[PDB]
Amino acid sequence: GITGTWYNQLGSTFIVTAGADGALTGTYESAVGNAESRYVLTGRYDSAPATDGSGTALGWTVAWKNNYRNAHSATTWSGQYVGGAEARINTQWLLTSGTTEANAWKSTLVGHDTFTKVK
Amino acid sequence: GITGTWYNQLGSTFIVTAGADGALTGTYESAVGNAESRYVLTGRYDSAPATDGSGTALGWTVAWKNNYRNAHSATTWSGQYVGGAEARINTQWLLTSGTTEANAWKSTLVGHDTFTKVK
Amino acid sequence: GITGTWYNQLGSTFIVTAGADGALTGTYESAVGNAESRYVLTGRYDSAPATDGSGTALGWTVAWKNNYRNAHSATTWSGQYVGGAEARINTQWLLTSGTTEANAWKSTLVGHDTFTKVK
Amino acid sequence: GITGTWYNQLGSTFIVTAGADGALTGTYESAVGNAESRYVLTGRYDSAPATDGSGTALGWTVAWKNNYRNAHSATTWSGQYVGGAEARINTQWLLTSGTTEANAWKSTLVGHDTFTKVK
């Protein structure tokens, strides 16, 4: 149930394909909704999850560089798919920016995102 | 300088290719060193980093499932390459395990890894 | 507005006093609601927050040891108070368990809690 | 062995008292070394740690406000004391800044600190 369009709370959109081999490929759109705000996502998911009501572990990365903008940063999301009635991807993320060694201590933001298939 | 074999402190080995398009592909080996402990890694890196001594932002994901073992979990690393003399990848990571909703609060470990090209 | 009883989503209860000097003192109750599940909390908050609609930065620690139970672990919450109509404390937390050096890599859980004054 | 002066890699200094009741009190000095860069720290530690070579779980908070400067932010450290020969406190930390709801997603930095009793 991972393949599809997912929306976070903040209004970002993640279009993903889950391949039989464990590969995630797709696009992440920061909230705007134009070509300029689309970035390649790659990831991995558990292709053989536990049959006991456990969620499916997954993760993906976006480098914030496309043909229009380079933020010299990358976010990774680490999380799990929950195939509920209204399914959800619950994640925590790390956004690392490229820095000098002096600013390396303040390079990494952390947060959390919930995604649904409902805008 | 990202393409190559990298070793973490704990003795894990990351073989990676950095493609011109921002793609990372490769294998992550938990410390053992046999076929059974090899897992596909996919990621993204900043292909056009800042020319001011800033590091290169990157991230990658391993789902802990191969032909031999499934830990029903995924780690993402978020970090930066520093093209020093002895170059390094400084990361923080999140390891999410597939869980029940009741155990979802204790699903995610966080830590940090430094990688070098020197065993 | 920090002084009071706050409830997280999971059903834990935080009773806190915010002193004029920046001190937080109080008790954290894991969801049960008896004397056996009460632990001392200590923390700090910004006593002079920005007058521009910014939240108030705060943090606190619970060592999971009382007269009844010792989990040999400590959680810290780092967050901000938002004096809305229905006010909230938005936090992320780290739960570190005492471990051997060999298990030090898996010592630290991370997550997030929202607290309200409404059960 | 927690009571004493501890130095992080970056050159910050933590003077702490570990009380019999689980309380940490003290001062955190960002790297400078003058009165202007001293801040109150409060925390908790496991007063009865495991007798099996496990570290002692601890955590503390500094609100970045003193009589001289207010950064409208708070750091929490979550970690463990390891009573080695050369003892160490291994931590991960969260630095939350007070923000608007719009900037709440980028409010929280994460990192790691190792402390020793050796400058």
mmCIF file of N, CA, C and O in Angstrom, chain A residues 40-50 52-63 65 70 72-80 82 88 90 92-101 104 107-108, chain B residues 40 42-50 52-63 65 70 72-80 82 88 90 92-101 104 107-108:
data_model
loop_
_atom_site.group_PDB
_atom_site.id
_atom_site.type_symbol
_atom_site.label_atom_id
_atom_site.label_comp_id
_atom_site.label_asym_id
_atom_site.label_seq_id
_atom_site.Cartn_x
_atom_site.Cartn_y
_atom_site.Cartn_z
ATOM 1 N N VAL A 40 13.882 14.646 -6.694
ATOM 2 C CA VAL A 40 13.974 13.155 -6.736
ATOM 3 C C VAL A 40 14.081 12.621 -5.303
ATOM 4 O O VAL A 40 14.926 13.129 -4.542
ATOM 5 N N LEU A 41 13.252 11.641 -4.959
ATOM 6 C CA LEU A 41 13.379 10.842 -3.719
ATOM 7 C C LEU A 41 13.811 9.427 -4.070
ATOM 8 O O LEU A 41 13.283 8.887 -5.064
ATOM 9 N N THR A 42 14.775 8.894 -3.318
ATOM 10 C CA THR A 42 15.102 7.432 -3.352
ATOM 11 C C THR A 42 15.085 6.862 -1.945
ATOM 12 O O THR A 42 15.313 7.628 -0.973
ATOM 13 N N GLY A 43 14.717 5.615 -1.817
ATOM 14 C CA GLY A 43 14.593 4.978 -0.503
ATOM 15 C C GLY A 43 14.565 3.471 -0.578
ATOM 16 O O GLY A 43 14.717 2.892 -1.670
ATOM 17 N N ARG A 44 14.335 2.859 0.568
ATOM 18 C CA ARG A 44 14.215 1.399 0.758
ATOM 19 C C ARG A 44 13.051 1.138 1.700
ATOM 20 O O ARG A 44 12.706 2.041 2.483
ATOM 21 N N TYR A 45 12.378 0.021 1.517
ATOM 22 C CA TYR A 45 11.335 -0.454 2.469
ATOM 23 C C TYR A 45 11.495 -1.970 2.650
ATOM 24 O O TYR A 45 12.032 -2.624 1.773
ATOM 25 N N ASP A 46 11.056 -2.453 3.797
ATOM 26 C CA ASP A 46 10.882 -3.875 4.114
ATOM 27 C C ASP A 46 9.861 -4.485 3.138
ATOM 28 O O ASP A 46 8.668 -4.304 3.354
ATOM 29 N N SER A 47 10.321 -5.267 2.165
ATOM 30 C CA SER A 47 9.450 -5.943 1.164
ATOM 31 C C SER A 47 8.705 -7.150 1.765
ATOM 32 O O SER A 47 7.718 -7.595 1.137
ATOM 33 N N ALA A 48 9.139 -7.675 2.915
ATOM 34 C CA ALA A 48 8.520 -8.842 3.578
ATOM 35 C C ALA A 48 8.212 -8.514 5.033
ATOM 36 O O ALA A 48 8.797 -9.078 5.937
ATOM 37 N N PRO A 49 7.253 -7.621 5.322
ATOM 38 C CA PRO A 49 6.963 -7.238 6.706
ATOM 39 C C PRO A 49 6.319 -8.330 7.572
ATOM 40 O O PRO A 49 5.796 -9.306 7.042
ATOM 41 N N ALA A 50 6.415 -8.154 8.889
ATOM 42 C CA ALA A 50 5.904 -9.099 9.904
ATOM 43 C C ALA A 50 4.385 -9.185 9.763
ATOM 44 O O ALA A 50 3.753 -8.118 9.625
ATOM 45 N N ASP A 52 1.810 -9.715 11.878
ATOM 46 C CA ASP A 52 1.343 -9.671 13.289
ATOM 47 C C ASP A 52 0.732 -8.296 13.637
ATOM 48 O O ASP A 52 0.539 -8.031 14.859
ATOM 49 N N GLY A 53 0.412 -7.471 12.631
ATOM 50 C CA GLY A 53 -0.112 -6.101 12.808
ATOM 51 C C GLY A 53 0.969 -5.028 12.938
ATOM 52 O O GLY A 53 0.579 -3.838 13.038
ATOM 53 N N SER A 54 2.255 -5.403 12.933
ATOM 54 C CA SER A 54 3.411 -4.473 12.842
ATOM 55 C C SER A 54 3.336 -3.638 11.561
ATOM 56 O O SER A 54 2.871 -4.154 10.518
ATOM 57 N N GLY A 55 3.812 -2.397 11.621
ATOM 58 C CA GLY A 55 3.966 -1.539 10.435
ATOM 59 C C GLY A 55 5.146 -1.994 9.590
ATOM 60 O O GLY A 55 5.938 -2.844 10.047
ATOM 61 N N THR A 56 5.257 -1.455 8.382
ATOM 62 C CA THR A 56 6.381 -1.738 7.456
ATOM 63 C C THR A 56 7.439 -0.629 7.567
ATOM 64 O O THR A 56 7.112 0.494 7.249
ATOM 65 N N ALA A 57 8.664 -0.972 7.966
ATOM 66 C CA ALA A 57 9.788 -0.024 8.116
ATOM 67 C C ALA A 57 10.193 0.473 6.737
ATOM 68 O O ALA A 57 10.299 -0.354 5.803
ATOM 69 N N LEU A 58 10.380 1.795 6.616
ATOM 70 C CA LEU A 58 10.875 2.397 5.357
ATOM 71 C C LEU A 58 11.688 3.641 5.634
ATOM 72 O O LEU A 58 11.707 4.126 6.789
ATOM 73 N N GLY A 59 12.388 4.119 4.614
ATOM 74 C CA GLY A 59 13.153 5.366 4.735
ATOM 75 C C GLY A 59 13.420 5.887 3.363
ATOM 76 O O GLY A 59 13.508 5.056 2.435
ATOM 77 N N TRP A 60 13.601 7.194 3.236
ATOM 78 C CA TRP A 60 13.985 7.766 1.930
ATOM 79 C C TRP A 60 14.754 9.042 2.136
ATOM 80 O O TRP A 60 14.783 9.558 3.245
ATOM 81 N N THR A 61 15.393 9.508 1.090
ATOM 82 C CA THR A 61 16.286 10.687 1.134
ATOM 83 C C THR A 61 15.875 11.617 0.004
ATOM 84 O O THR A 61 15.657 11.119 -1.089
ATOM 85 N N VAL A 62 15.884 12.912 0.230
ATOM 86 C CA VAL A 62 15.800 13.953 -0.843
ATOM 87 C C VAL A 62 17.014 14.861 -0.616
ATOM 88 O O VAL A 62 17.178 15.396 0.496
ATOM 89 N N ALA A 63 17.852 15.004 -1.612
ATOM 90 C CA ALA A 63 18.823 16.107 -1.710
ATOM 91 C C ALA A 63 18.057 17.275 -2.311
ATOM 92 O O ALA A 63 17.367 17.084 -3.324
ATOM 93 N N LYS A 65 18.215 19.655 -4.307
ATOM 94 C CA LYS A 65 18.809 20.175 -5.543
ATOM 95 C C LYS A 65 18.012 19.612 -6.701
ATOM 96 O O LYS A 65 17.857 18.396 -6.769
ATOM 97 N N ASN A 70 19.134 24.837 -5.502
ATOM 98 C CA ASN A 70 20.030 24.015 -4.661
ATOM 99 C C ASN A 70 20.139 24.633 -3.267
ATOM 100 O O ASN A 70 20.795 25.667 -3.150
ATOM 101 N N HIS A 72 21.715 23.020 -0.876
ATOM 102 C CA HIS A 72 22.941 22.412 -0.299
ATOM 103 C C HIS A 72 22.627 21.693 1.004
ATOM 104 O O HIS A 72 23.344 21.927 1.969
ATOM 105 N N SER A 73 21.569 20.886 1.005
ATOM 106 C CA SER A 73 21.067 20.140 2.170
ATOM 107 C C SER A 73 20.365 18.867 1.688
ATOM 108 O O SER A 73 20.123 18.734 0.484
ATOM 109 N N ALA A 74 20.133 17.929 2.606
ATOM 110 C CA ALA A 74 19.456 16.653 2.323
ATOM 111 C C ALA A 74 18.632 16.319 3.558
ATOM 112 O O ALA A 74 19.140 16.552 4.670
ATOM 113 N N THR A 75 17.410 15.875 3.368
ATOM 114 C CA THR A 75 16.556 15.300 4.418
ATOM 115 C C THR A 75 16.459 13.785 4.223
ATOM 116 O O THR A 75 16.325 13.315 3.087
ATOM 117 N N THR A 76 16.556 13.042 5.310
ATOM 118 C CA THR A 76 16.190 11.634 5.322
ATOM 119 C C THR A 76 14.988 11.482 6.232
ATOM 120 O O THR A 76 14.960 12.128 7.283
ATOM 121 N N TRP A 77 14.075 10.634 5.855
ATOM 122 C CA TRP A 77 12.892 10.253 6.649
ATOM 123 C C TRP A 77 13.100 8.794 6.996
ATOM 124 O O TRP A 77 13.478 8.000 6.099
ATOM 125 N N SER A 78 12.865 8.446 8.265
ATOM 126 C CA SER A 78 12.921 7.063 8.750
ATOM 127 C C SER A 78 11.575 6.816 9.398
ATOM 128 O O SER A 78 11.147 7.653 10.204
ATOM 129 N N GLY A 79 10.898 5.741 9.048
ATOM 130 C CA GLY A 79 9.511 5.601 9.511
ATOM 131 C C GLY A 79 8.923 4.249 9.250
ATOM 132 O O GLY A 79 9.686 3.289 9.008
ATOM 133 N N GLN A 80 7.607 4.184 9.352
ATOM 134 C CA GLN A 80 6.847 2.960 9.032
ATOM 135 C C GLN A 80 5.494 3.286 8.411
ATOM 136 O O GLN A 80 4.929 4.318 8.726
ATOM 137 N N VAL A 82 1.695 2.134 8.007
ATOM 138 C CA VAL A 82 0.650 1.430 8.789
ATOM 139 C C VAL A 82 -0.515 1.277 7.837
ATOM 140 O O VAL A 82 -1.151 2.297 7.554
ATOM 141 N N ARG A 88 -1.334 5.381 6.918
ATOM 142 C CA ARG A 88 -0.428 6.492 7.276
ATOM 143 C C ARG A 88 1.029 6.050 7.248
ATOM 144 O O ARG A 88 1.327 4.883 7.525
ATOM 145 N N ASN A 90 4.190 7.256 9.319
ATOM 146 C CA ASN A 90 4.715 7.995 10.495
ATOM 147 C C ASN A 90 6.233 7.998 10.425
ATOM 148 O O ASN A 90 6.818 6.897 10.375
ATOM 149 N N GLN A 92 10.167 10.126 11.403
ATOM 150 C CA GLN A 92 10.980 11.213 11.933
ATOM 151 C C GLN A 92 12.008 11.517 10.864
ATOM 152 O O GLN A 92 12.321 10.635 10.057
ATOM 153 N N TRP A 93 12.501 12.729 10.865
ATOM 154 C CA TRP A 93 13.411 13.106 9.769
ATOM 155 C C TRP A 93 14.615 13.839 10.342
ATOM 156 O O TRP A 93 14.524 14.381 11.420
ATOM 157 N N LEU A 94 15.682 13.849 9.590
ATOM 158 C CA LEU A 94 16.908 14.641 9.771
ATOM 159 C C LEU A 94 17.207 15.408 8.482
ATOM 160 O O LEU A 94 17.313 14.816 7.460
ATOM 161 N N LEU A 95 17.331 16.724 8.607
ATOM 162 C CA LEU A 95 17.717 17.656 7.543
ATOM 163 C C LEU A 95 19.125 18.147 7.889
ATOM 164 O O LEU A 95 19.282 18.859 8.859
ATOM 165 N N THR A 96 20.106 17.707 7.140
ATOM 166 C CA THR A 96 21.522 18.105 7.262
ATOM 167 C C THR A 96 21.798 19.129 6.174
ATOM 168 O O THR A 96 21.495 18.840 5.011
ATOM 169 N N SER A 97 22.414 20.247 6.536
ATOM 170 C CA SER A 97 22.891 21.263 5.554
ATOM 171 C C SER A 97 24.398 21.139 5.424
ATOM 172 O O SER A 97 25.041 20.841 6.451
ATOM 173 N N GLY A 98 24.949 21.350 4.224
ATOM 174 C CA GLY A 98 26.412 21.430 4.084
ATOM 175 C C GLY A 98 26.957 22.623 4.851
ATOM 176 O O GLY A 98 26.397 23.727 4.686
ATOM 177 N N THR A 99 27.950 22.442 5.713
ATOM 178 C CA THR A 99 28.488 23.561 6.551
ATOM 179 C C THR A 99 30.013 23.521 6.583
ATOM 180 O O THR A 99 30.600 22.467 6.239
ATOM 181 N N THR A 100 30.615 24.583 7.109
ATOM 182 C CA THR A 100 32.023 24.608 7.583
ATOM 183 C C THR A 100 32.129 23.748 8.825
ATOM 184 O O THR A 100 31.068 23.522 9.439
ATOM 185 N N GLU A 101 33.336 23.277 9.158
ATOM 186 C CA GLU A 101 33.578 22.470 10.378
ATOM 187 C C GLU A 101 33.135 23.259 11.618
ATOM 188 O O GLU A 101 32.549 22.629 12.527
ATOM 189 N N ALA A 104 29.456 22.887 12.034
ATOM 190 C CA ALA A 104 29.051 21.480 11.860
ATOM 191 C C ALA A 104 28.113 21.069 13.010
ATOM 192 O O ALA A 104 27.223 20.214 12.761
ATOM 193 N N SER A 107 24.457 21.805 12.080
ATOM 194 C CA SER A 107 24.184 21.358 10.692
ATOM 195 C C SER A 107 22.867 20.595 10.568
ATOM 196 O O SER A 107 22.407 20.463 9.387
ATOM 197 N N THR A 108 22.320 20.026 11.651
ATOM 198 C CA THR A 108 21.281 18.953 11.502
ATOM 199 C C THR A 108 20.009 19.291 12.243
ATOM 200 O O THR A 108 20.054 19.413 13.431
ATOM 201 N N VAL B 40 21.489 -3.786 0.446
ATOM 202 C CA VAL B 40 21.429 -2.691 -0.569
ATOM 203 C C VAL B 40 21.256 -1.351 0.153
ATOM 204 O O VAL B 40 20.360 -1.251 1.013
ATOM 205 N N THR B 42 20.531 2.750 -0.837
ATOM 206 C CA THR B 42 20.236 3.822 -1.840
ATOM 207 C C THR B 42 20.187 5.177 -1.154
ATOM 208 O O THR B 42 19.891 5.232 0.067
ATOM 209 N N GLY B 43 20.573 6.209 -1.857
ATOM 210 C CA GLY B 43 20.638 7.554 -1.279
ATOM 211 C C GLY B 43 20.702 8.642 -2.323
ATOM 212 O O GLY B 43 20.621 8.359 -3.533
ATOM 213 N N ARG B 44 20.881 9.860 -1.849
ATOM 214 C CA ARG B 44 21.020 11.088 -2.658
ATOM 215 C C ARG B 44 22.135 11.928 -2.056
ATOM 216 O O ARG B 44 22.419 11.767 -0.856
ATOM 217 N N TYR B 45 22.841 12.664 -2.891
ATOM 218 C CA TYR B 45 23.840 13.668 -2.428
ATOM 219 C C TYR B 45 23.701 14.927 -3.296
ATOM 220 O O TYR B 45 23.226 14.833 -4.415
ATOM 221 N N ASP B 46 24.086 16.053 -2.726
ATOM 222 C CA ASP B 46 24.272 17.337 -3.412
ATOM 223 C C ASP B 46 25.357 17.178 -4.490
ATOM 224 O O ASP B 46 26.532 17.207 -4.144
ATOM 225 N N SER B 47 24.967 17.120 -5.760
ATOM 226 C CA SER B 47 25.905 16.991 -6.910
ATOM 227 C C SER B 47 26.641 18.310 -7.209
ATOM 228 O O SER B 47 27.670 18.254 -7.920
ATOM 229 N N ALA B 48 26.156 19.452 -6.712
ATOM 230 C CA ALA B 48 26.761 20.780 -6.945
ATOM 231 C C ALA B 48 26.982 21.494 -5.618
ATOM 232 O O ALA B 48 26.360 22.501 -5.340
ATOM 233 N N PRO B 49 27.905 21.030 -4.762
ATOM 234 C CA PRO B 49 28.111 21.655 -3.454
ATOM 235 C C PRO B 49 28.729 23.060 -3.483
ATOM 236 O O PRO B 49 29.300 23.459 -4.494
ATOM 237 N N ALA B 50 28.557 23.790 -2.381
ATOM 238 C CA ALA B 50 29.031 25.180 -2.210
ATOM 239 C C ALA B 50 30.557 25.183 -2.289
ATOM 240 O O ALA B 50 31.174 24.300 -1.659
ATOM 241 N N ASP B 52 33.023 27.024 -0.905
ATOM 242 C CA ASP B 52 33.411 27.926 0.211
ATOM 243 C C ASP B 52 33.974 27.130 1.410
ATOM 244 O O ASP B 52 34.094 27.736 2.513
ATOM 245 N N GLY B 53 34.332 25.854 1.211
ATOM 246 C CA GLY B 53 34.817 24.947 2.272
ATOM 247 C C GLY B 53 33.708 24.201 3.015
ATOM 248 O O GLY B 53 34.068 23.377 3.892
ATOM 249 N N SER B 54 32.432 24.454 2.695
ATOM 250 C CA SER B 54 31.264 23.670 3.174
ATOM 251 C C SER B 54 31.393 22.200 2.762
ATOM 252 O O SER B 54 31.924 21.915 1.664
ATOM 253 N N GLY B 55 30.889 21.295 3.595
ATOM 254 C CA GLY B 55 30.782 19.866 3.258
ATOM 255 C C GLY B 55 29.660 19.630 2.259
ATOM 256 O O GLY B 55 28.861 20.554 2.001
ATOM 257 N N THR B 56 29.604 18.428 1.696
ATOM 258 C CA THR B 56 28.538 18.011 0.753
ATOM 259 C C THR B 56 27.454 17.226 1.506
ATOM 260 O O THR B 56 27.774 16.177 2.022
ATOM 261 N N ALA B 57 26.216 17.722 1.514
ATOM 262 C CA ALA B 57 25.066 17.082 2.188
ATOM 263 C C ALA B 57 24.727 15.793 1.454
ATOM 264 O O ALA B 57 24.689 15.802 0.203
ATOM 265 N N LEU B 58 24.519 14.714 2.220
ATOM 266 C CA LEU B 58 24.082 13.423 1.641
ATOM 267 C C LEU B 58 23.229 12.649 2.621
ATOM 268 O O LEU B 58 23.138 13.041 3.807
ATOM 269 N N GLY B 59 22.578 11.605 2.129
ATOM 270 C CA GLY B 59 21.781 10.729 2.997
ATOM 271 C C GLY B 59 21.579 9.430 2.291
ATOM 272 O O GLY B 59 21.559 9.446 1.043
ATOM 273 N N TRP B 60 21.379 8.357 3.043
ATOM 274 C CA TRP B 60 21.055 7.060 2.415
ATOM 275 C C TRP B 60 20.250 6.218 3.366
ATOM 276 O O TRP B 60 20.149 6.556 4.537
ATOM 277 N N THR B 61 19.660 5.166 2.849
ATOM 278 C CA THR B 61 18.742 4.287 3.607
ATOM 279 C C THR B 61 19.194 2.853 3.390
ATOM 280 O O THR B 61 19.483 2.515 2.252
ATOM 281 N N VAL B 62 19.147 2.025 4.409
ATOM 282 C CA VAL B 62 19.268 0.537 4.289
ATOM 283 C C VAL B 62 18.025 -0.024 4.990
ATOM 284 O O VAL B 62 17.789 0.299 6.169
ATOM 285 N N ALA B 63 17.240 -0.803 4.289
ATOM 286 C CA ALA B 63 16.254 -1.719 4.885
ATOM 287 C C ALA B 63 17.027 -2.978 5.241
ATOM 288 O O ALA B 63 17.775 -3.485 4.391
ATOM 289 N N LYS B 65 16.929 -6.087 5.293
ATOM 290 C CA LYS B 65 16.394 -7.303 4.671
ATOM 291 C C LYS B 65 17.265 -7.621 3.473
ATOM 292 O O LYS B 65 17.448 -6.746 2.633
ATOM 293 N N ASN B 70 15.971 -10.798 7.743
ATOM 294 C CA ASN B 70 15.048 -9.645 7.788
ATOM 295 C C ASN B 70 14.850 -9.198 9.237
ATOM 296 O O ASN B 70 14.167 -9.915 9.968
ATOM 297 N N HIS B 72 13.179 -6.445 9.891
ATOM 298 C CA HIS B 72 11.936 -5.632 9.860
ATOM 299 C C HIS B 72 12.193 -4.229 10.386
ATOM 300 O O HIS B 72 11.419 -3.787 11.226
ATOM 301 N N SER B 73 13.265 -3.598 9.915
ATOM 302 C CA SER B 73 13.718 -2.260 10.329
ATOM 303 C C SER B 73 14.471 -1.602 9.169
ATOM 304 O O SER B 73 14.782 -2.287 8.189
ATOM 305 N N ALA B 74 14.672 -0.288 9.258
ATOM 306 C CA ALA B 74 15.390 0.503 8.244
ATOM 307 C C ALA B 74 16.151 1.582 8.999
ATOM 308 O O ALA B 74 15.578 2.126 9.961
ATOM 309 N N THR B 75 17.391 1.818 8.632
ATOM 310 C CA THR B 75 18.198 2.958 9.091
ATOM 311 C C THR B 75 18.337 3.975 7.955
ATOM 312 O O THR B 75 18.542 3.586 6.800
ATOM 313 N N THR B 76 18.195 5.247 8.280
ATOM 314 C CA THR B 76 18.588 6.324 7.385
ATOM 315 C C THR B 76 19.742 7.060 8.036
ATOM 316 O O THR B 76 19.699 7.264 9.252
ATOM 317 N N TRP B 77 20.691 7.472 7.246
ATOM 318 C CA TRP B 77 21.837 8.304 7.658
ATOM 319 C C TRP B 77 21.640 9.627 6.950
ATOM 320 O O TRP B 77 21.328 9.630 5.733
ATOM 321 N N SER B 78 21.812 10.728 7.690
ATOM 322 C CA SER B 78 21.758 12.088 7.144
ATOM 323 C C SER B 78 23.072 12.727 7.543
ATOM 324 O O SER B 78 23.437 12.634 8.723
ATOM 325 N N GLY B 79 23.789 13.322 6.611
ATOM 326 C CA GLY B 79 25.151 13.760 6.944
ATOM 327 C C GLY B 79 25.779 14.621 5.892
ATOM 328 O O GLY B 79 25.051 15.170 5.039
ATOM 329 N N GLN B 80 27.089 14.764 5.999
ATOM 330 C CA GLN B 80 27.890 15.492 4.996
ATOM 331 C C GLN B 80 29.268 14.867 4.817
ATOM 332 O O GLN B 80 29.794 14.307 5.762
ATOM 333 N N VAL B 82 33.107 15.548 3.965
ATOM 334 C CA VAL B 82 34.121 16.614 4.149
ATOM 335 C C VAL B 82 35.340 16.129 3.396
ATOM 336 O O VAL B 82 35.969 15.187 3.887
ATOM 337 N N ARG B 88 36.123 12.447 5.442
ATOM 338 C CA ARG B 88 35.176 11.825 6.391
ATOM 339 C C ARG B 88 33.733 12.110 6.000
ATOM 340 O O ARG B 88 33.444 13.166 5.427
ATOM 341 N N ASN B 90 30.439 12.495 8.177
ATOM 342 C CA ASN B 90 29.836 12.698 9.519
ATOM 343 C C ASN B 90 28.324 12.619 9.384
ATOM 344 O O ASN B 90 27.765 13.405 8.592
ATOM 345 N N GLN B 92 24.300 11.576 11.302
ATOM 346 C CA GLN B 92 23.436 11.087 12.370
ATOM 347 C C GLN B 92 22.462 10.135 11.708
ATOM 348 O O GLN B 92 22.213 10.264 10.505
ATOM 349 N N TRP B 93 21.946 9.211 12.477
ATOM 350 C CA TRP B 93 21.090 8.190 11.850
ATOM 351 C C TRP B 93 19.841 7.988 12.697
ATOM 352 O O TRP B 93 19.862 8.288 13.869
ATOM 353 N N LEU B 94 18.817 7.464 12.079
ATOM 354 C CA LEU B 94 17.566 6.961 12.667
ATOM 355 C C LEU B 94 17.323 5.531 12.185
ATOM 356 O O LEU B 94 17.286 5.304 11.022
ATOM 357 N N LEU B 95 17.165 4.617 13.136
ATOM 358 C CA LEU B 95 16.819 3.208 12.925
ATOM 359 C C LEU B 95 15.385 3.036 13.431
ATOM 360 O O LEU B 95 15.160 3.133 14.620
ATOM 361 N N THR B 96 14.455 2.856 12.525
ATOM 362 C CA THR B 96 13.027 2.607 12.800
ATOM 363 C C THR B 96 12.790 1.115 12.639
ATOM 364 O O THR B 96 13.162 0.576 11.590
ATOM 365 N N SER B 97 12.132 0.497 13.610
ATOM 366 C CA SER B 97 11.689 -0.924 13.512
ATOM 367 C C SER B 97 10.195 -0.946 13.251
ATOM 368 O O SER B 97 9.503 -0.061 13.793
ATOM 369 N N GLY B 98 9.706 -1.905 12.456
ATOM 370 C CA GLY B 98 8.251 -2.087 12.323
ATOM 371 C C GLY B 98 7.641 -2.494 13.653
ATOM 372 O O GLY B 98 8.186 -3.424 14.285
ATOM 373 N N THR B 99 6.605 -1.813 14.130
ATOM 374 C CA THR B 99 6.000 -2.118 15.464
ATOM 375 C C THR B 99 4.477 -2.097 15.379
ATOM 376 O O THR B 99 3.931 -1.540 14.396
ATOM 377 N N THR B 100 3.825 -2.566 16.439
ATOM 378 C CA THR B 100 2.393 -2.303 16.735
ATOM 379 C C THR B 100 2.236 -0.841 17.099
ATOM 380 O O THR B 100 3.267 -0.246 17.471
ATOM 381 N N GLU B 101 1.023 -0.292 16.974
ATOM 382 C CA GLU B 101 0.731 1.113 17.350
ATOM 383 C C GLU B 101 1.089 1.341 18.825
ATOM 384 O O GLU B 101 1.638 2.424 19.128
ATOM 385 N N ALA B 104 4.747 1.969 19.095
ATOM 386 C CA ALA B 104 5.190 2.924 18.063
ATOM 387 C C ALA B 104 6.072 4.009 18.710
ATOM 388 O O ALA B 104 6.992 4.508 18.010
ATOM 389 N N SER B 107 9.757 2.918 18.693
ATOM 390 C CA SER B 107 10.115 2.350 17.370
ATOM 391 C C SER B 107 11.452 2.871 16.848
ATOM 392 O O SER B 107 11.979 2.205 15.898
ATOM 393 N N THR B 108 11.951 4.022 17.321
ATOM 394 C CA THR B 108 13.018 4.755 16.560
ATOM 395 C C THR B 108 14.240 5.013 17.410
ATOM 396 O O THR B 108 14.127 5.699 18.381
#
